[PDB]
Amino acid sequence: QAEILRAYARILEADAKILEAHAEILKAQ
Amino acid sequence: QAEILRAYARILEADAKILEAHAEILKAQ
Amino acid sequence: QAEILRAYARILEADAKILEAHAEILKAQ
Amino acid sequence: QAEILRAYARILEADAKILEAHAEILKAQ
Amino acid sequence: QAEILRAYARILEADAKILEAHAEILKAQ
Amino acid sequence: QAEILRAYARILEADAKILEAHAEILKAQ
Amino acid sequence: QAEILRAYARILEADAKILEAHAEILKAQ
Amino acid sequence: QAEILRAYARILEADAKILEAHAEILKAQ
Amino acid sequence: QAEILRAYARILEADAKILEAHAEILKAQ
Amino acid sequence: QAEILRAYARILEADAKILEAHAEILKAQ
Amino acid sequence: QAEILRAYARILEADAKILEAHAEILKAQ
Amino acid sequence: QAEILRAYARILEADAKILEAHAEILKAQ
Amino acid sequence: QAEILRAYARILEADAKILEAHAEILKAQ
Amino acid sequence: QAEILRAYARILEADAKILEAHAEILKAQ
Amino acid sequence: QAEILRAYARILEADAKILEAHAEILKAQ
Amino acid sequence: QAEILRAYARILEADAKILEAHAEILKAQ
Amino acid sequence: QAEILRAYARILEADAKILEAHAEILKAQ
Amino acid sequence: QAEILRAYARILEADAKILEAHAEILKAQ
Amino acid sequence: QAEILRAYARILEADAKILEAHAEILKAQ
Amino acid sequence: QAEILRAYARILEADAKILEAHAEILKAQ
Amino acid sequence: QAEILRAYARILEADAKILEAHAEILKAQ
Amino acid sequence: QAEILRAYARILEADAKILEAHAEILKAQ
Amino acid sequence: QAEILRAYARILEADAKILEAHAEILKAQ
Amino acid sequence: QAEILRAYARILEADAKILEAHAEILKAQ
Amino acid sequence: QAEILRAYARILEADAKILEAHAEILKAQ
Amino acid sequence: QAEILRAYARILEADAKILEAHAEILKAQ
Amino acid sequence: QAEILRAYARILEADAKILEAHAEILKAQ
Amino acid sequence: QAEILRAYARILEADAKILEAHAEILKAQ
Amino acid sequence: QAEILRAYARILEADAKILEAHAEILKAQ
Amino acid sequence: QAEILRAYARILEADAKILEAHAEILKAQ
Amino acid sequence: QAEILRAYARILEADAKILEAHAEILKAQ
Amino acid sequence: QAEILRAYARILEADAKILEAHAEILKAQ
Amino acid sequence: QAEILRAYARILEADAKILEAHAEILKAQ
Amino acid sequence: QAEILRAYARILEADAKILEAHAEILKAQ
Amino acid sequence: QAEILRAYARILEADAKILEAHAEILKAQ
Amino acid sequence: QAEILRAYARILEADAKILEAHAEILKAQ
Amino acid sequence: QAEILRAYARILEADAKILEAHAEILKAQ
Amino acid sequence: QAEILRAYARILEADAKILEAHAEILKAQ
Amino acid sequence: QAEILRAYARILEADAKILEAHAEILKAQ
Amino acid sequence: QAEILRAYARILEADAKILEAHAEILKAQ
């Protein structure tokens, strides 16, 4: 496992912080 | 499990946070 | 279970959050 | 149960939120 | 592993810290 | 490794400290 | 190595202290 | 080396102590 | 060297002691 | 050297004491 | 008489906050 | 008499908020 | 009688804070 | 009776802090 | 009776501090 | 009765300090 | 019973100091 | 019983001093 | 039993002084 | 068993003095 | 001329803020 | 002439804000 | 004349802050 | 003249902070 | 005159600090 | 005058420090 | 007068340090 | 009267040093 | 009276030195 | 009277040195 | 493309926001 | 490009923000 | 560029920030 | 540049910070 | 430069810092 | 300079530190 | 200078230190 | 100077030390 | 001086040492 | 001085030593 399926959320949460910052590099570009 | 089926929500919640950010890179593109 | 049958709502609530965002990527596409 | 019959409302409420967004993806199709 | 898949969360965490800083150089450039 | 894959985080953390300082030189330039 | 890849952090940490001081000379310049 | 690559940190640390002092001479100049 | 490359630190440490004292003659000047 | 480059540190070590005391005679001047 | 009957308004105001909260539990039940 | 009659209006104003909430609880009855 | 009946308002205010929190638990349940 | 019934408000205030914390655990569960 | 019932608030206050901390462990789990 | 039930708060306070530290060990894990 | 249950707090206080240090060793690992 | 359990705190206090020092060897490693 | 378990604290106190020095030998290494 | 274990502390106390002196001659090396 | 008549606007703007508040005191009176 | 006529508009706009509030005081008269 | 009549605006602004607060004391009275 | 009428603004601003706090003493009363 | 009326602004300033604290004693009473 | 009325400000500030501390004793009571 | 009323400030400041410490004894009690 | 009331400040200052230490004995008790 | 009440300060100062040291025997106990 | 109470200050001054050293023989025990 | 035809919709969407604002400036012409 | 034609949307979007601001100046003029 | 045409968006964005600020000055003028 | 045209954005950014500050002076004027 | 045009930003930044500070003096005036 | 124009920023920076301090002297005035 | 214009910054820096000290005397006055 | 203008900084530096100490005689007054 | 104007700094430095001690004589008074 | 003005510093230096000694005998008085 129940944590094993729960652990991918912490993986996939970090995939947002790539992308929501990836707009910011275009924002003041 | 009742948590095992509940834990997929925490998976699927962050799946949205990809996509709403995935528009934001195309927003100020 | 009464919660077991209730728990699928928290699944299915987030199931919309893909799709209402999955148009927003198509919105400013 | 009286809540067991009441619990399906929370299921079927979110069943709409799929579909009313599922036309919004066809809006900017 | 359960930590092995959990360890990449610490890997990808700082990958955002590159990019949000990598806009800040473009900010006052 | 589990530490070997963990060790690159300490590497990649310091890559940010270049860049967030690399804006500060351009900040009061 | 595991230390060999770990040792570059101590190298790269000091690369910040060049640069964050390299703004301070331009600060009261 | 493992010390050979480690020893440059002690070299590069003192390079900061030039520059953070190099602001101080310009500070009360 | 491993000492030969290490020995320049003892040179470069005292190079700071010129400069941090070089502000002090300008301090109470 | 190895002492030859090390001996210059002892030369430059005293060069601070020329200067760090040079302020002191300017201090109560 | 002025504030004494005024005080029951603050009493009766909180009675409204029970009942909608006593209804809000019935909504997502 | 000006405020004494006016104070009951603040009393009866809260009496509405009971009853509509008392019927709002019948909506999700 | 001024504060004595005013005191139950502070009592009854926190009674609402139970129930909406007693509702929020069933929301993400 | 002024403070005696006032004290239960401080008792009942923390009961709300249980339940939303008893809710927040089920959120990221 | 004044402090005797006041003390349970100090008991029950820290009981909230368990549960949000009992939630934060599941967040980065 | 006054201090005897007061002391458990000091016991239960440190019980929270376990768990957030038990949480922080998973963060950099 | 006053100090006897008080002393366990001093025991349990140090148990927090283990774990954050047992976490800090994971941070720069 | 009072000091006999008090002494384990002094035992466990020094156990924290190992681990942060066991982390400090990792930092400049 | 009092001093006998107290004596290990004086043992374990000196165990910290190894390791922080065992780090300090790595710092100027 | 009183000083028999305390004597090792006097042994291990000087063991730290070796290592910092093993560090100090590495400092001005 | 141009600003002098604009100055009375900033006067007369705040002249309403009495009156719209001067009903609010009569509102919950 | 262009702004001078427009300046009275900013006057006469705020002349309404007296009066529409000046009936609101008659609302709870 | 420009600032002299402008100063009454700063006077009359705070005249409102009496009255909107003067209702708030009557609000929870 | 100009500062003298501005001085009462600093006076009359403080008259608000009496009164807006004067409700707060009735708020948790 | 100008400071003499400004002096009461410092006087009445702390008069609020009585009352907002004089509610905080009533807050957790 | 101007200091004499300023003197009560230093008096009346300390009256607050009684009361805001006078709540803290009742806070963790 | 001017010091005589100033002297009670030094009196009344110390009345706080009784009370803010008087909570701290009840804090870890 | 100037020093005679000033002398109690030196009296009352040390009254705090009892109590802030009086917590410290109960702190590690 | 000036020294006679001042003498108790030298009494009461050392009254603290009992108690702050009285924790120290409980500290490393 | 003036010295007679100062004499007890010298008495109680040494009473700390009994106790503050009493921990020291317990410290390295 | 299908996006190439979709992209001009984002172009022409902004073309509306020019003109209504370009006529909004004619409202306060 | 497809982004090249998308880029002018970000150009033309800011053109709207001029004109309403070029109108908002005309409003309070 | 594609960034070159994107670069004027950052130029033209700040051009709007002039004008609304160039309007806000005329508001409180 | 592309940075040359980007550089004027940093120039024109601070021009907005003049004018609202050039407005805020007229607000409390 | 490109720095020459960047340098005026550092000039014009502090020009904003005058005016808001030139406003704050008029606030508490 | 390029430093010559940078030098006035250090001049104009301290000009702001006058005025807020020139403001703070009116606050407690 | 270039130092000549830099030297006035050291002059004008101390001018700020007068005025806040010229305020702190007015604070506890 | 260039030193002649630098010398007045050392003059004016000590002028600050009067005034903050001039406040300290008022604080414990 | 150039020393003549520098010499008054040594005069004015000791002027501060009067006053802070002239405060310290008030503290334990 | 040039010594004539410098000699008063040696006069005024010992003048501080009177006053702190005038304070120190007041401390243990």
Short mmCIF file of all heavy atoms in Angstrom, two decimals, chain d residues 3-23:
data_model
loop_
_atom_site.label_atom_id
_atom_site.label_comp_id
_atom_site.label_asym_id
_atom_site.label_seq_id
_atom_site.Cartn_x
_atom_site.Cartn_y
_atom_site.Cartn_z
N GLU d 3 25.63 45.58 57.67
CA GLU d 3 26.62 44.54 57.42
C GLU d 3 26.10 43.16 57.80
O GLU d 3 26.52 42.16 57.21
CB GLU d 3 27.90 44.83 58.18
CG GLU d 3 29.11 44.08 57.65
CD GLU d 3 30.25 44.05 58.64
OE1 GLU d 3 30.08 44.58 59.75
OE2 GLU d 3 31.31 43.49 58.30
N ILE d 4 25.20 43.10 58.79
CA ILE d 4 24.75 41.83 59.35
C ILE d 4 23.98 41.03 58.32
O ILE d 4 24.05 39.79 58.30
CB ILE d 4 23.91 42.09 60.61
CG1 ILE d 4 24.50 43.25 61.41
CG2 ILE d 4 23.83 40.85 61.46
CD1 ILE d 4 23.77 43.55 62.69
N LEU d 5 23.26 41.71 57.45
CA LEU d 5 22.61 41.01 56.36
C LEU d 5 23.55 40.83 55.18
O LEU d 5 23.37 39.90 54.38
CB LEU d 5 21.34 41.75 55.96
CG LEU d 5 20.58 42.13 57.24
CD1 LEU d 5 19.52 43.18 56.99
CD2 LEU d 5 19.97 40.90 57.87
N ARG d 6 24.56 41.69 55.06
CA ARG d 6 25.58 41.46 54.05
C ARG d 6 26.46 40.27 54.40
O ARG d 6 27.05 39.65 53.52
CB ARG d 6 26.45 42.70 53.86
CG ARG d 6 25.81 43.77 53.03
CD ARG d 6 26.77 44.91 52.80
NE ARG d 6 27.07 45.64 54.02
CZ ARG d 6 27.98 46.59 54.11
NH1 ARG d 6 28.67 46.93 53.03
NH2 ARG d 6 28.19 47.21 55.25
N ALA d 7 26.56 39.96 55.69
CA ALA d 7 27.34 38.81 56.11
C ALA d 7 26.71 37.51 55.64
O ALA d 7 27.42 36.58 55.24
CB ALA d 7 27.50 38.81 57.63
N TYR d 8 25.38 37.43 55.66
CA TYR d 8 24.70 36.22 55.20
C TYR d 8 24.85 36.05 53.70
O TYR d 8 24.76 34.92 53.20
CB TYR d 8 23.22 36.25 55.55
CG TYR d 8 22.91 36.50 57.00
CD1 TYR d 8 21.77 37.20 57.36
CD2 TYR d 8 23.74 36.04 58.01
CE1 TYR d 8 21.47 37.44 58.67
CE2 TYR d 8 23.44 36.28 59.33
CZ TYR d 8 22.31 36.98 59.65
OH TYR d 8 22.01 37.21 60.97
N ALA d 9 25.05 37.15 52.98
CA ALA d 9 25.33 37.07 51.56
C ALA d 9 26.64 36.35 51.30
O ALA d 9 26.73 35.54 50.38
CB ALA d 9 25.34 38.46 50.94
N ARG d 10 27.65 36.62 52.12
CA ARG d 10 28.90 35.88 52.00
C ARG d 10 28.74 34.43 52.43
O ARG d 10 29.44 33.55 51.92
CB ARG d 10 30.00 36.55 52.82
CG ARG d 10 31.40 36.12 52.45
CD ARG d 10 32.45 36.98 53.12
NE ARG d 10 33.79 36.52 52.81
CZ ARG d 10 34.48 35.67 53.57
NH1 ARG d 10 33.94 35.19 54.68
NH2 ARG d 10 35.70 35.30 53.21
N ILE d 11 27.80 34.16 53.34
CA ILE d 11 27.50 32.78 53.72
C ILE d 11 26.87 32.05 52.55
O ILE d 11 27.35 30.99 52.13
CB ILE d 11 26.58 32.75 54.94
CG1 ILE d 11 27.27 33.39 56.14
CG2 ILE d 11 26.17 31.32 55.24
CD1 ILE d 11 26.36 33.58 57.32
N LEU d 12 25.81 32.62 52.00
CA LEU d 12 25.10 31.96 50.92
C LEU d 12 25.87 31.98 49.61
O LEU d 12 25.54 31.22 48.70
CB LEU d 12 23.74 32.60 50.72
CG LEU d 12 22.55 31.87 51.35
CD1 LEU d 12 22.36 30.55 50.64
CD2 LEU d 12 22.73 31.64 52.84
N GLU d 13 26.88 32.85 49.50
CA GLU d 13 27.71 32.86 48.30
C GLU d 13 28.47 31.55 48.16
O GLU d 13 28.55 30.98 47.07
CB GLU d 13 28.69 34.03 48.35
CG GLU d 13 29.13 34.54 47.00
CD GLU d 13 29.61 35.97 47.06
OE1 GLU d 13 28.87 36.82 47.60
OE2 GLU d 13 30.73 36.26 46.57
N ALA d 14 29.01 31.04 49.27
CA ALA d 14 29.73 29.79 49.22
C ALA d 14 28.81 28.59 49.10
O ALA d 14 29.29 27.50 48.75
CB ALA d 14 30.59 29.64 50.47
N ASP d 15 27.52 28.75 49.36
CA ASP d 15 26.61 27.62 49.29
C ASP d 15 26.38 27.17 47.86
O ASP d 15 26.00 26.02 47.62
CB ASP d 15 25.29 27.97 49.95
CG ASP d 15 25.46 28.26 51.41
OD1 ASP d 15 26.62 28.23 51.87
OD2 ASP d 15 24.46 28.50 52.11
N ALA d 16 26.60 28.06 46.89
CA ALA d 16 26.58 27.64 45.50
C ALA d 16 27.75 26.72 45.18
O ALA d 16 27.57 25.70 44.52
CB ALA d 16 26.60 28.85 44.58
N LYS d 17 28.94 27.06 45.69
CA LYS d 17 30.15 26.32 45.36
C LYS d 17 30.14 24.92 45.93
O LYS d 17 30.82 24.04 45.40
CB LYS d 17 31.38 27.07 45.87
CG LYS d 17 31.71 28.30 45.05
CD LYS d 17 31.19 29.55 45.73
CE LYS d 17 31.03 30.69 44.75
NZ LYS d 17 30.23 31.80 45.32
N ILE d 18 29.38 24.69 47.00
CA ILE d 18 29.09 23.33 47.42
C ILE d 18 28.32 22.62 46.33
O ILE d 18 28.63 21.48 45.96
CB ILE d 18 28.29 23.33 48.73
CG1 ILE d 18 28.86 24.36 49.70
CG2 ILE d 18 28.28 21.95 49.34
CD1 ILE d 18 28.05 24.53 50.95
N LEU d 19 27.33 23.29 45.76
CA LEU d 19 26.37 22.61 44.92
C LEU d 19 26.80 22.60 43.46
O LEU d 19 26.60 21.59 42.77
CB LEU d 19 25.00 23.26 45.07
CG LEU d 19 24.08 22.72 46.17
CD1 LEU d 19 23.86 21.23 45.99
CD2 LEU d 19 24.56 23.03 47.58
N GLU d 20 27.39 23.69 42.97
CA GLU d 20 27.78 23.72 41.56
C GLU d 20 28.97 22.82 41.30
O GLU d 20 29.15 22.34 40.18
CB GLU d 20 28.08 25.15 41.12
CG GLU d 20 29.29 25.80 41.77
CD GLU d 20 29.28 27.31 41.63
OE1 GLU d 20 29.16 27.80 40.49
OE2 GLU d 20 29.37 28.01 42.66
N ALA d 21 29.78 22.56 42.32
CA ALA d 21 30.80 21.55 42.19
C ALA d 21 30.26 20.16 42.48
O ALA d 21 30.87 19.18 42.06
CB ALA d 21 31.97 21.84 43.14
N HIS d 22 29.12 20.07 43.17
CA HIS d 22 28.55 18.77 43.51
C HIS d 22 28.10 18.04 42.26
O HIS d 22 28.17 16.81 42.20
CB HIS d 22 27.38 18.94 44.47
CG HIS d 22 27.09 17.72 45.27
ND1 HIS d 22 27.78 17.40 46.42
CD2 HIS d 22 26.18 16.73 45.10
CE1 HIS d 22 27.31 16.28 46.92
NE2 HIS d 22 26.33 15.85 46.14
N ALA d 23 27.67 18.78 41.25
CA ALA d 23 27.38 18.18 39.96
C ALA d 23 28.63 17.71 39.25
O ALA d 23 28.56 16.72 38.51
CB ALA d 23 26.65 19.18 39.06
#
